[PDB]
Amino acid sequence: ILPLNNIQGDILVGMKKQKERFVFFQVNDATSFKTALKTYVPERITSAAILISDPSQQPLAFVNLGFSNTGLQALGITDDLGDAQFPDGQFADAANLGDDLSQWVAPFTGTTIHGVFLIGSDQDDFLDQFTDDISSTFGSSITQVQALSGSARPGDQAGHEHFGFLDGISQPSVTGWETTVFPGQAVVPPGIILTGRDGDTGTRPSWALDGSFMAFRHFQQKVPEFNAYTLANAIPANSAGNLTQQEGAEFLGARMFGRWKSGAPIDLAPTADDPALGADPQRNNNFDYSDTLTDETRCPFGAHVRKTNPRQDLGGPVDTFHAMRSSIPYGPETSDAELASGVTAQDRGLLFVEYQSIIGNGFRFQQINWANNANFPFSKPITPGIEPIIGQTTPRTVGGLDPLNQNETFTVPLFVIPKGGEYFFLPSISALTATIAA
Ligand code: HEM
Ligand SMILES: O=C1O[C@H]([C@@H](O)CO)C(O)=C1O
């Protein structure tokens, strides 16, 4: 039985707030920081139990807190957490992920960052008040080195990312607590997500129980460029018949992601959007690629969702490589003038957050072994190629996007630019005060 009151809520449940701020900080004075932490944590750090409660019993903003390796070292927290990538930080790992290092920016270009406060709220006012509360509480014991702020997109684009696609449909469900499981949803032991729980094979200090590792990525997205590419390479026809250019461009976007913008998965809706399906969590995840293991008519081998969660491409259920996501878009809407020009003029993108007990099995496996790997999924009749959305191998060639000409390859410009990121550990709530602040 998972102690829901002791697990930081963004890990297990997700804040699911309209606004989110990530306050990256360095510790100036370890003793004063720890003193502030002992009063801050009981008052502000939001558990999974709070997130599943009625909204009437919830605070106006949620706060979670993670530390980098250098943050833990700065606080005299010296026990090895057992993860291969966490100690060196993400900048040292960025080339491995395929990143263009020249696009990284301060303060992520090293290991100056000691931790991150994540604040979630449904409006800017409350977000700001809780941010100010951190500043007031911790004072000179920290220096804020960056704040990145995100917001859900407006109106009927709420829950969609900046390319236009509904994000946050498919998540693993962990055993150990009472929750609803949707058709097609993976069920995994809790240690896939929570350090020290069943399914976690890493060597953890006892105090690390019920923590998790966050892979944070700051992505800038090139939306007019993405849109222009889909129009220039619009699929002329599918099984159902000929497509207008607009239809063929929409279809090409859906082929690249593995879902239509509505969230309808192409494995279920292979020729036309089904928005009602996309909006129905009882149906929108109920597929496993078993109907398309050895052909690409229903779904390309290299589509985003298929690369990051291969389902039956692995031969059956596999616990090991699932991870939780709690990403949020950032930046202004793309104007009609920007879309017309085909050129990005404003900074917008995704503040990407993925949780797993073993970084190398979650985010990093999905990125390197799968998305970046032209020959994954394995044993296919046509080379899958590089995942078009976040795959980082050049040339960025992906096959099978045209269901009626599956040997045709598409060389896709990179529309998602990594600007920085870090690996954090989020301890349990008790660990924050009994270990970190001790
Ligand atoms: C700006 C960059 C990204 C965008 C715009 C994006 C967008 C999306 C969208 C629209 C979905 C479909 C909704 C869903 O199934 O929940 C999705 C699913 C998913 N993405 Fe991403 N994504 C991005 C980066 C990444 C990265 C870097 C990874 C990991 C390396 C990743 C891993 C996943 C996973 C695991 C799923 C769920 C797959 C499933 O269970 O079927 N995404 N993403
Ligand atoms: O996410 C997945 O869903 C199926 C199965 O677990 C559903 O029960 C599978 O093999 C996955 O990797």
Of 312, 313, 320, 325, which is best to mutate to test ligand 2, by the most ligand atoms within 8 angstroms of its C-beta?
A: 312
User: Using the 8-state DSSP alphabet, how is residue 333 labeled?
Assistant: P
Q: Is 400 annotated as a binding residue?
A: no
Backbone angles phi, psi at 368, to 5 degrees: -85, -55
Q: Is 11 annotated as a binding residue?
A: no
Residue nearest to atom 3 of ligand 2 (CA): 186
CA-based radius of gyration for the chain: 21
- Phi/psi region, residue 139 (left: phi>0; alpha: psi -120 to 50; beta: rest), is left
* 260 Cβ neighbours under 8 A, 6+ residues apart: 165, 250, 254, 266, 269, 273, 274, 275, 278
Residue nearest to atom 29 of ligand 1 (CA): 363
Number of the ligand 1 atom closest to the C-alpha atom of 366: 30
Sign of the CA dihedral with 236 first, then 237, 243, and 248 last: negative
Tokens of 10: 């963004």
C-alpha distances in Å from residue 149, one per residue of 82, 91, 116, 146, 156: 31, 21, 12, 10, 21
Residue nearest to atom 12 of ligand 2 (CA): 311
Element (H, E) at 144: strand 142-151
Could you list the beta-strand ranges (E) of 30-141.
Answer: 61-67, 115-121
Residue nearest to atom 1 of ligand 2 (CA): 186
Q: Is 64 annotated as a binding residue?
A: no
**Ligand 1 centroid from CA 389, angstroms:** 9
CA neighbor of 224 nearest in space, from 342, 358, 57, 115: 342
CA neighbor of 143 nearest in space, from 40, 26, 32, 65: 26
User: Using the 8-state DSSP alphabet, how is residue 186 labeled?
Assistant: -
Q: Is 168 annotated as a binding residue?
A: yes
Tokens of 30: 């370890």
Q: Does the C-beta of 352 come closer than 6 Å to ligand 1?
A: yes
Q: Does the C-beta of 327 come closer than 6 Å to ligand 1?
A: no
Q: Does the C-beta of 317 come closer than 6 Å to ligand 2?
A: yes
SS3 (DSSP) at 174: strand
Q: Does the C-beta of 288 come closer than 6 Å to ligand 2?
A: yes
Q: Is 218 annotated as a binding residue?
A: no
Tell the burial category of 237 from Cβ atoms under 10 Å away from its Cβ (0-12, 13-18, 19+): middle
CA neighbor of 199 nearest in space, from 85, 358, 314: 358
Ligand whose nearest atom lies closest to the CA of 150: 1
* 81 Cβ neighbours under 8 A, 6+ residues apart: 72, 87, 195, 202, 204, 205, 208, 425
**Ligand 1 centroid from CA 228, angstroms:** 21
For residues 17 and 122, the answer to whether their CB atoms sit within 8 Å is yes
Question: What was the elucidation method?
Answer: X-ray
- What whole-number distance in Å separates Cα of residue 277 and Cα of residue 139? 49
Residues paired with residue 354 on neighbouring β-strands, in sequence order: 215, 325
Q: What is the 3-state secondary structure (H, E, C) of 201-266?
A: CCCCCHHHCCCEEEEEEEEEECHHHHHHHHHHCCCCEECCEECCHHHHHHHHHHHHHCECCCCCEC
Ligand whose nearest atom lies closest to the CA of 171: 1
For residues 120 and 17, the answer to whether their CB atoms sit within 8 Å is yes
Ligand whose nearest atom lies closest to the CA of 305: 1
- Count up the domains in the chain and report the number: 1
How crowded is residue 332: how many other Cβ atoms within 10 Å of its Cβ?
A: 13
Backbone angles phi, psi at 305, to 5 degrees: -70, -30
For residues 424 and 354, the answer to whether their CB atoms sit within 8 Å is no
Q: HSE-up of 303 (CA within 13 Å, CB side)?
A: 32
Q: Does the C-beta of 344 come closer than 6 Å to ligand 2?
A: no
Resolution value in angstroms = 1.5
**Ligand 1 centroid from CA 304, angstroms:** 7
Q: Is 141 annotated as a binding residue?
A: no
Ligand whose nearest atom lies closest to the CA of 216: 1
- What whole-number distance in Å separates Cα of residue 267 and Cα of residue 297? 9
Number of the ligand 1 atom closest to the C-alpha atom of 370: 30
Which residue has tokens 């699929």?
235
Of 260, 328, 390, 417, which is best to mutate to test ligand 1, by the most ligand atoms within 8 angstroms of its C-beta?
A: 390
Tokens of 111: 């290991």
Q: Catalytic annotation on 167?
A: yes
**Ligand 1 centroid from CA 356, angstroms:** 15
Tokens of 92: 């040292």
Q: 134-163 burial by CB neighbour count: b if 16+ within 10 A, else e? A: beeebeebbeeebebbbbbbeeebebbbbb
Residue nearest to atom 11 of ligand 1 (CA): 167
Q: Does the C-beta of 370 come closer than 6 Å to ligand 1?
A: no
Catalytic residue from among 10, 83, 93, 167: 167
Tokens of 129: 């008040």
Q: Which domain, by its residues, includes 297?
A: 1-438
Tokens of 11: 């890990």
User: Using the 8-state DSSP alphabet, how is residue 199 labeled?
Assistant: T
For residues 257 and 306, the answer to whether their CB atoms sit within 8 Å is no
